[PDB]
Each structure stands twice: as C-alpha cells, then as structure tokens.
Design a protein around this ligand. Structure first.
Ligand SMILES: Nc1ncnc2c1ncn2[C@@H]1O[C@H](COP(=O)(O)OP(=O)(O)O)[C@@H](O)[C@H]1O
Length: 374
C-alpha cells in the first residue's frame, strides 16, 4: 500500500495525476469518481459526495493505469449500513470482540474469450495481470488454468482479501480489455462448459494461534472450529443469496449439499489440510459472480452464531436454495441474518433479490423466442 505523503511526492513529480476514489456496490464493482490528484491531495482525501470518506490505508497505485492511483471509501452522519464493505466490517468487529481474527482467501475463476468484447497466448493477459497486481501490493500466488483461468491470491485478513478480490476482478477486466480480449466472471456462460466458482477458505485466529486447531483432535479440528462449521451448515440457505445473487448463479448447479466432507464432490464445504496448523474450511457454493464482502460477511454470521450456541457438528460423507426466488425468501426469513446484520440491511438485499427477478419479467430472452415457435 501507498503512503499519503508518498502519493503527494508522486503528484508533484507529475507521475500520478488521477486518483480513483471508489466505493464497492452490491454487484461487487468499483464505483466512484476520478479526481485530479492535485485536488485529491489538497481537499479530495478529506471527503467528497455522490458521502464517501476515503480510507487512506487502502491507497494503492494502479499499475495497469497511467498516472493513476486508487483508494477505497467508507460510505456515510454515520456509516451506511447496507454498504457491502460496512456489512463485512461489522461481522469482523464481532469477531475481534471475541479475540478472533478471520483469515481468508478466494479462488477467483473467470473465462478468457478469444474475441474482443466488440500458453504464450494466455500469458499476454495473465502475465501482466500477475505482475501488475503484485506491483499494487496485492499478494498474488499465481494463475492456474482450469479458456477458463483462475487467480490465486495469498490469504490475508478477511477485509484485505475482499479488497484484493475486488481489485483483482477489476484488473482482469481492464488488462484483458487493453489486450483486446474479453473476460467474464459469469458463473455459467454456456451449458456445454464448466461453471466458474469463487471458493472461499476461512480460518479464525487468536493472538497468533490457529483457533481451528486441536493437535489432540482426531483429524485436527478444535472445539471452536467444529462449532463454527456447524453454524455455516445450519444457515447455508440463509446466506445462499450472497453466494448466488443472479438468475445465472443457479445454472452452475447442474457442490450444493448442506454437508461437510474431506473427500466428497457433493459437499458444499470441503475441509482442507486436515491435521495441520493450516486447517480451514472451504465453501464451494459461490460462483465467481459473487460480492466478496457479502459472501464473507454472510458466512461469518453463521460461523459466529454456530459458536454462540455450541452447536454440534454432524458427520461428513439439506440442499441450498435451487433458485433465486427460493434463495431470496430464505434470506427474508433468516432471523439469524436479521439479528446479525439488521432488519433494515436484510430487507434491503431482499428487495435487491426482488428487483433481480422482476428485471427478468421485462426482457424477452432468446430462449423464450426459440422455444416459443413451438
Ligand atoms: N490458514 C489459512 N486460512 C485461509 N486461507 C488459507 C490458509 N492457508 C492457505 N490458505 C489459502 O488457500 C488457498 C488454496 O491453497 P492450496 O489449495 O493449499 O494450494 P496452494 O496453497 O499450494 O496454492 C490459497 O490461496 C491460500 O492462500
């Protein structure tokens, strides 16, 4: 990350002239304004409207853009509750009031199309992606080909991980564009091809130790981790919507069973690195269309309250909402998320799901037409 005073040298030098002052919307997108950096260092970092308060800890250079830097903001006379960033921070603050620090990672998938939007060949997008992100302070492990690719970023404090996921989403679209190539984070862009997921690894820490670990434990799972996983499991449909916010999200489901497992393909929750310090939980429910903040904040809610009831952990080996109408309702009736996040926030994202279904009633798809000549 980039010191404010450091920015101000880069501005007077004339190396940086743009600061993207962003928040993150429901869709998971960077939204905001593009300030002339002189204005930003003089009164723009203070506050601007749309109110956005820049968080100078989030200030980065943006190597895949000339003269350009960015900062993420808190949206405000207090913090607006249904802002995804704010929603994730709230859960995390619960966690720290218990001495617990969440540590998280995202296996972000996408599709590289050969045409513009209008090994060597892949790397013309992937290599800059890796290199520029790394040069933005984001801890890139690398790329793995699943034209379906995947970006590995080293785990981090959950709020870091969310920012990274977001920024890397952004960088990929931009770098692909500049490379004349399309990229989509669609969970299912076609029937014939694989779904793109966003697997989410999680673990809790306390003052430095892996709270999820009992060296004692049969496979390495401590008391608290079991309560945690049991919560994720109990409330998987409550927050299915934050994993699967669009119509198209449910077509990846052709990894949806409310079970945990260390070997299964059907379990919505894989157990990784059994036996070790790096013991953690993998949620495989989300596709790559998801909002990181919300998906993270949703599970932490379920994980926290799994602990606060000392809920018991069933053996490894019902179903999550199979569509968006069901998932929306499952959120509406989520008295868990209601208390965890607030009645107003839940109602807000319920309405968000409502608008998404209604948006469908107002366009006539190609599939209707084709199937409609009988
Ligand atoms: N304790 C942990 N908590 C959360 N995420 C972790 C932890 N340890 C590793 N990870 C993350 O899990 C992801 C999956 O990594 P893995 O499947 O072990 O292959 P590799 O680590 O060799 O890339 C990695 O991006 C890594 O950052």
């Amino acid at each position: 990350t980039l010191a404010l005073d450091d920015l101000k040298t880069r501005v007077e030098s004339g190396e940086i002239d743009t600061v993207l002052v962003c928040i993150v919307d429901m869709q998971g997108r960077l939204m905001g304004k593009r300030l002339h950096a002189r204005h930003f260092v003089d009164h723009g970092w203070e506050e601007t409207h749309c109110i956005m308060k820049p968080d100078l800890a989030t200030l980065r250079c943006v190597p895949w853009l000339e003269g350009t830097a960015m900062v993420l903001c808190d949206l405000l006379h207090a913090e607006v509750p249904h802002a995804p960033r704010a929603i994730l921070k709230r859960q995390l603050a619960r966690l720290e009031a218990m001495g617990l620090e969440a540590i998280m990672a995202t296996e972000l998938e996408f599709f590289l199309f050969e045409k513009s939007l209008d090994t060597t060949k892949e790397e013309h997008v992937l290599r800059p992606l890796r290199n520029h992100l790394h040069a933005a302070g984001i801890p890139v492990e690398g790329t793995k080909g699943e034209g379906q690719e995947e970006l590995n970023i080293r785990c981090a404090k959950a709020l870091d991980t969310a920012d990274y996921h977001t920024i890397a989403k952004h960088a990929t679209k931009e770098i692909a564009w500049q490379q004349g190539r399309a990229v989509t984070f669609l969970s299912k862009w076609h029937h014939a091809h694989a779904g793109s997921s966003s697997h989410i690894h999680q673990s809790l820490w306390k003052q430095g130790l892996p709270a999820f670990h009992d060296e004692r434990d049969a496979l390495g799972m401590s008391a608290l981790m079991k309560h945690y996983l049991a919560g994720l499991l109990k409330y998987a449909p409550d927050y299915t919507y934050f994993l699967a916010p669009y119509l198209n999200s449910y077509k990846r489901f052709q990894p949806t069973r409310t079970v945990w497992s260390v070997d299964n393909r059907t379990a919505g929750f894989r157990l990784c690195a059994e036996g070790t310090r790096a013991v953690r939980i993998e949620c495989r429910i989300g596709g790559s269309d998801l909002n990181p903040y919300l998906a993270m904040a949703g599970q932490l809610a379920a994980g926290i309250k799994g602990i606060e009831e000392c809920l018991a952990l069933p053996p490894p080996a019902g179903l999550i909402p199979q569509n968006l109408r069901d998932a929306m309702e499952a959120l509406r009736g989520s008295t868990m998320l209601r208390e965890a996040m607030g009645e107003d926030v839940v109602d807000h994202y319920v309405r968000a799901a409502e608008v998404e279904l209604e948006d469908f009633q107002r366009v006539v798809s190609d599939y209707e037409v084709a199937r409609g000549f009988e």
